Each structure stands twice: as structure tokens, then as C-alpha cells.
């Protein structure tokens, strides 16, 4: 029983580490690139920061 | 006891995952729509009324 | 009690897989639409040409 | 002693209500179910495409 | 008396009738104060003041310790059921139903919900886009069938075809307009439904500003009191020196004369 | 993040919503128009053979009339799509921020109470100190009067 539960704990930790170090890092990079590409695109078209117009 | 604590932590991370995924999908969808529309039209969507 | 705790862990793994599967499905869906829009720009020009029946 | 402690820890985890996401208070099992239903709904809407 | 002056300064409602009551209250204090100075010895009165000052410092320390604990007190702690009803003691203010104080949601948690809702809209868009493509294909098939039946090469058949296409275009465009109006109605209803909520937020916003201004007033007053108490301390020292100087310069020389 | 970062995030959320909602409504309108077109095409498919017996002069007048009606409807549709619709969507998009703002307000209000409560405590304490100083000051004035007698 102690050995089995230990395996369960290791599986949960591996899952969390996979989510935090692999999955979220990849997703956050894609989000940041997309937000920058977007801000550059509209800054070029509007000659000003797009967010100033919405304030 | 350690397994119990890890359950709560692991679940918060799953929620963070869900959030970032939803945001990703929403930005991609925005980009797809902007590419199908003329920039002048979209500009009217976002900003028309705020431009002198 | 230990069986119940194991059930929660299984459910967490399942939901995590569901979120990641959903993410992959959406990535494919946006790639297919970008390829189809490139093809369809060609076909739509054709039919509105029936307004040109002058002589 | 150990057998009794383990039963209590697991019971507390199943019954405890916390703000996990948003403005609503729920148990871990409820919030997890909600999240599962939401992605099932999302997947069903994509297969009908 | 001082507190009453303080409350009146914060509540801008300069009620014009409250001055005569103030004077009476000052006089009453003077008389009482004088009686105290005549009934008790100055050393006793000073000792009493020292003791009263010890109590104030003690209370301040107690509040800090409790208040600081509150800052360091964040919710894991379980509702221990302790029993005994004595009297009531509902709250120091008098009552305390409120503590729903469930951990107010964090920006992060709310914004997360916002993005989840945005995805619901994007998902709906995809669904409707697929439906519009099916319908467009179905309509093209039907138009082709109708055109094949009017192909008997007669000038009247060509004109009949053109008339069909024109009637069809009109029906489609009417349908689009009606749909857009319908959608605009929905968006208006939704915005109208939330207009009350927005009013409420505006009121809250006003309240926050007012209460921000209220906090500014309490701070400006705290500044004035602090400055005022520092000046009084200097004045007491000056008065003590003046009384001693009078005894030395004017009274002590009389026995020799 | 700085209030500024949060604002930016909120705005991003709005912009994403505007883009998606606008396209959604356009697609809903297209879909509805196609549906009505399809229904009409299906109902008038059998009548088109009987109209071919009409005098050429009547069909020409009808086509011209229909062309003029189509232009009017198109101009109305474009007006709704380009002027009324984008404004309404934007207004709705701003409403997305309501729960977040509310949440913040609530948080601020709650914060305001703590500072104000301590402010009142300090003010009353500072006032208790002043009351004690004024009593001592009066004590010196009375003593000076007795020395003069």
C-alpha cells in the first residue's frame, strides 16, 4: 500500500511539473508573441498606441 | 498527507492551464477574423467614434 | 478512503488531457481554415460575374 | 491511529469549499466536474463542425 | 466637546445653530475644570493625568497587536464552534452579520472568467460559419435547378431568369437587414438590461470618490491635530516658566521690604 | 501588474470580444439571409414556368423596380452594418469589464474602511491628548491669577 501511494504522489507531481514547465511555458510564449504582433500591427496602422484610444 | 497537498496544488495549475489555453484560442480567433477582413473595416470596429 | 483519493487523481489526469486535446483540435482547425480561405478566394469571384451581362 | 488519520484527511478534502476560479465557492470535485463539462461541451460543438 | 467640533468639520453641513451650545459646553468645562483644580492638589491632578496617559498607550498597543494579527490572519482557520452565549456581544460596533467575507475574488480569477466567456463567443462563431456554408451550397444547387428549367432559348425565358435572380437578391438582402436589426435589438436589450448595473457602479464609483475624499478629510484633520498637540506641549512649557518667573521676580522680594 | 497592465488586459479582452462578436453577428445575418433565400427559392420554383407567359414589357418594368428596391435595401443594410452595429458591439464589449470593475471597487471600498477606521481612532486619540493639555494650560492660568492677588 505504501509503495502504491507513493507512485500516485509521483504521478501527480510529474503531471504538475509537465503542466508548469512544459505546457504553460509554451502557451505563454505563443500568447506573448501574438500580443506583440498585434500591438505592432495596429501601432503602424494608427501612428499611436491602440490602447490610448480606448482609454 | 503529501498526496493531499499535491492534489490542491495540481488542481490550481490545471485552472491556470485552462485560462491560458482559453486566452490563446481567443487571440488566434481574433487574428483569423482580422485576416479575412480589410484593416479599414476592422479599424472601424475597434476605434470608429474615438477618431476625430 | 485511499480509493477515493486515487479516483480524484484519475479525474485530474482526465480533465488535463481534455484541455490539451481541445487545444490541439483548435490549432488544427485554424490551420485548415487558413488553407481553405486561400483556395476559396478563387471560386467566389466567379459567381458574382453574372451581373456583367451587358452586351 | 494511522488508519483513522488517513480516513479524516480524505474526508476533509472531499467536503472542503473553496474559491477555486471566478466568483463562486465550490468543492474541488464540483469545480473539476464543471471544468470537465465545459470542455465536453466545447468538443461536442467542434465535432458537429 | 472636541470630538463634536471634529464631526461637524467632516459632515460639511454647517448647521447654523450649533455655536450657542458650544459655548455653554466650554463654560461648563471651565467651571468643572476650576473645581477640580480647587478640590484636588496639583501633584495629584498631574499623577492622575500620567495614569490616564499610560492607559491610552496600553490601548493603542493592544489595538496594534490585534490589528497586526488580523493582517497576518488569512482564512485557512476552521470555524471552531466554541459554545458559551454569555449575554450577546454581537460586535464591538453592535452587530456583525456581514462576514460573508469570502475572499473577494482576485483580478486574476475574474479576468480568467472573462476570457472563458470570450471563447464561448468564438465557439459560437465557428458553429454559425459552418451552418452558413451549408446553406450557401444548398442555395446554389437550387438556383442551378431553376435556371435549367428556363433554358428554352426564348428571349422571354432569359428575361424571366433575370427577374428571378433580381427577386432572389432582394429577398436575401431583406433577410440580411432583418437579421442585423434583430441582432442590434438583442445587443440593445442586453445593454439596457445592464444599464441599471452600470448606474449602480457609477454610484459606487461616486461613493469611492466621496469616501476617498472622506479619507482625505480625516487625514487632513489628523495632520492638524498632530500639529495642534505639538504646539500645546510647547505652550505648557512656556506657561510653567512664566509662573516661576513671576514668583521669583515679583513675590519673593516682598519679605525684605 | 500595474493598474496599467490590468487595464491593458481588460482592453485586450474587449478587443478580442469585439472582433469575434462582430464577425459572429455578420455570420448570423448571412446565415439568416441564406435561410430565407432558400425558403423563397423553394416556394417559387413551380410558379416560374407560368410567368413566362407574361408580356415582355411587364417583366422589364418589374426587373427595373426590383433593381431600385435592392439598391435601397443595400444602402439600409450597409448603414446598419457600418454605423449602428459597430457602436452597439463596442458598448457591449465595455460591459465585459463590469464584473472586474465591480470586483476592484469592492476591493477598494473594503480597503477605504480600514484606513478610515484607523484615521478615526488616531483622531480621537489625538483629541484625548489635546483635552489633557488644555486642562494643564488652564491650571497654570489659575495659579498665576492667585499669585497676583
The nearest alpha carbon in chain E to D23 belongs to E105
Resolution of the experimentally solved model in angstroms: 33.0
The answer to whether D6 and D15 are in contact (CB under 8 A) is no
Closest Cβ–Cβ partner in F20, F82, F89 for B30: F20
A51 shares contact with chain F (CB less than 8 Å) = yes
Q: Which residues pair with D18 in a beta bridge?
A: D26
Q: Which residues contact E57 (CB under 8 A, 6 or more apart)?
A: none
Measure the CA angle with vertex E11, ends E9 and E12; round to 5°.
Answer: 75
Residue of C30, E5, B44, B3 whose CA lies nearest to F78: B44
Q: Is D23 exposed, middle or buried (0-12, 13-18, 19+ CB in 10 A)?
A: middle
C8 shares contact with chain A (CB less than 8 Å) = no
Using an 8 Å CB-CB cutoff, list chain B residues near A24. 13, 16-17, 20
E119 shares contact with chain D (CB less than 8 Å) = yes
Phi-psi region of B40 (alpha: psi -120 to 50; beta: other; left: phi over 0): alpha
Q: Which residues pair with D17 in a beta bridge?
A: D27
Mapped onto helix, strand or coil, the DSSP state of residue D17 is: strand
Neighbouring chains of F at 3+ CB pairs under 8 Å are A, B, E
The answer to whether B30 and F20 are in contact (CB under 8 A) is yes
Q: What is the phi/psi pair of residue D27, to 5°? A: -75, 165
CA distance E32 to E38: 10
Using an 8 Å CB-CB cutoff, list chain B residues near A16. 6, 9-10, 13
Strand pairing category for D17-18 and D26-27: antiparallel
Across D4-43, the runs of DSSP E, i.e. the strands, are 17-18, 26-27
CA distance C1 to D11: 8
What is the 3-state secondary structure of chain E?
A: CHHHHHHHHHCCCCCCCCCHHHHHHHHHHHHHHHHHHHHCCHHHHHHHHHHHHHHHHHHHHHHHHHHHHHHCCCCCCCCCCCCCCCCCCCCCCCCCCCCCCCCCCCHHHHHHHHHHHHHHHHHHHHHHHHHHHHHHHHHHHHHHHHHHHCCCCCHHHHHHHHHHHHHHHHHHHHHHHHHHHHHHHHHHHHHHHHHHHHHHHHHHHHHHHHHHHHHHHHHHHHHHHHHHHHHHHHHHHHHHHHHHHHHHHHHCCCCCC
The answer to whether A11 and A4 are in contact (CB under 8 A) is no
Classify residue B37 by its DSSP letter: S
- Cell 481541445 -> residue: C22
How many residue contacts between B and E have a Cβ separation below 8 Å?
20
Q: How was this structure determined?
A: cryo-EM
Amino acid at each position: 500500500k505504501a509503495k502504491f501511494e507513493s507512485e500516485v504522489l509521483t504521478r501527480l507531481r510529474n503531471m504538475r511539473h509537465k503542466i508548469k514547465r512544459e505546457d504553460l511555458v509554451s502557451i505563454e510564449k505563443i500568447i506573448a508573441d501574438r500580443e506583440r504582433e498585434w500591438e505592432r500591427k495596429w501601432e503602424k496602422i494608427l501612428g499611436k498606441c491602440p490602447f490610448s484610444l480606448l482609454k | 498527507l503529501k498526496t493531499d497537498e499535491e492534489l490542491a496544488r495540481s488542481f490550481r495549475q490545471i485552472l491556470d492551464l485552462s485560462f491560458k489555453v482559453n486566452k490563446e484560442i481567443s487571440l488566434q480567433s481574433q487574428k483569423a477574423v482580422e485576416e479575412t477582413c480589410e484593416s479599414a473595416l476592422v479599424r472601424q470596429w475597434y476605434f470608429d467614434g474615438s477618431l476625430p | 478512503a485511499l480509493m477515493r483519493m486515487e479516483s480524484l487523481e484519475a479525474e485530474m489526469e482526465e480533465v488535463t488531457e481534455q484541455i490539451l486535446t481541445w487545444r490541439e483540435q483548435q490549432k488544427t482547425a485554424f490551420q485548415m481554415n487558413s488553407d481553405a480561405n486561400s483556395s476559396c478566394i478563387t471560386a467566389q469571384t466567379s459567381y458574382l460575374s453574372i451581373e456583367n451581362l451587358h452586351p | 491511529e494511522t488508519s483513522e488519520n488517513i480516513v479524516d484527511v480524505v474526508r476533509e478534502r472531499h467536503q472542503s469549499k473553496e474559491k477555486w476560479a471566478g466568483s463562486t465557492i465550490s468543492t474541488l470535485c464540483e469545480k473539476m466536474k464543471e471544468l470537465r463539462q465545459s470542455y465536453e461541451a466545447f468538443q461536442q460543438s467542434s465535432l458537429q463542425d | 466637546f472636541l470630538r463634536s467640533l471634529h464631526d461637524d468639520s467632516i459632515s460639511s453641513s454647517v448647521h447654523p445653530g450649533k455655536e450657542d451650545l458650544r459655548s455653554l459646553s466650554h463654560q461648563q468645562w471651565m467651571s468643572m475644570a476650576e473645581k477640580v483644580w480647587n478640590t484636588h492638589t496639583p501633584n495629584h491632578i498631574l499623577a492622575a493625568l500620567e495614569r490616564l496617559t499610560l492607559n491610552s498607550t496600553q490601548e493603542l498597543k493592544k489595538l496594534q497587536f490585534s490589528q497586526a494579527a488580523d493582517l497576518s490572519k488569512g482564512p485557512s482557520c476552521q470555524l471552531k464552534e466554541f459554545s458559551e452565549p454569555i449575554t450577546q456581544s454581537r460586535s464591538c460596533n453592535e452587530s456583525t452579520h456581514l462576514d460573508p467575507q469570502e475572499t473577494l475574488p482576485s483580478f486574476h480569477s475574474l479576468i480568467q472568467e472573462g476570457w472563458a466567456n470570450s471563447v464561448k463567443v468564438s465557439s459560437e462563431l465557428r458553429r454559425v460559419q459552418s451552418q452558413a456554408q451549408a446553406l450557401s451550397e444548398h442555395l446554389a444547387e437550387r438556383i442551378q435547378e431553376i435556371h435549367k428549367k428556363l433554358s428554352d432559348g426564348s428571349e422571354v425565358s432569359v428575361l424571366t431568369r433575370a427577374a428571378f435572380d433580381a427577386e432572389l437578391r432582394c429577398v436575401i438582402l431583406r433577410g440580411c437587414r432583418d437579421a442585423l436589426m434583430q441582432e442590434c435589438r438583442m445587443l440593445q436589450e442586453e445593454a439596457a438590461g445592464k444599464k441599471q448595473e452600470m448606474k449602480l457602479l457609477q454610484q459606487q464609483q461616486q461613493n469611492i470618490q466621496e469616501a476617498c475624499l472622506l479619507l482625505d478629510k480625516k487625514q487632513k484633520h489628523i495632520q492638524i491635530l498632530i500639529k495642534g498637540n505639538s504646539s500645546s506641549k510647547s505652550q505648557i512649557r512656556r506657561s510653567s516658566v512664566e509662573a516661576q518667573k513671576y514668583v521669583q521676580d515679583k513675590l519673593l522680594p516682598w519679605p525684605q521690604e | 501588474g500595474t493598474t496599467e497592465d490590468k487595464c491593458k488586459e481588460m482592453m485586450r479582452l474587449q478587443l478580442a470580444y469585439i472582433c469575434a462578436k462582430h464577425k459572429l453577428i455578420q455570420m448570423k445575418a448571412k446565415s439568416a439571409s441564406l435561410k430565407v433565400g432558400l425558403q423563397w427559392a423553394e416556394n417559387n420554383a413551380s410558379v416560374v414556368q407560368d410567368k413566362a407567359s407574361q408580356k415582355e414589357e411587364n417583366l422589364k418594368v418589374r426587373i427595373t423596380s426590383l433593381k431600385n428596391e435592392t439598391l435601397q435595401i443595400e444602402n439600409h443594410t450597409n448603414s446598419i452594418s457600418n454605423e449602428k452595429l459597430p457602436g452597439l458591439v463596442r458598448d457591449n464589449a465595455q460591459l465585459l469589464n463590469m464584473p472586474i470593475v465591480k470586483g476592484d471597487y469592492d476591493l477598494q471600498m473594503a480597503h477605504q474602511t480600514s484606513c478610515s477606521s484607523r484615521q478615526d481612532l488616531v483622531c480621537d486619540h489625538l483629541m484625548k491628548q489635546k483635552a489633557s493639555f488644555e486642562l494643564l494650560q488652564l491650571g497654570y492660568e489659575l495659579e498665576l491669577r492667585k499669585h497676583r492677588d
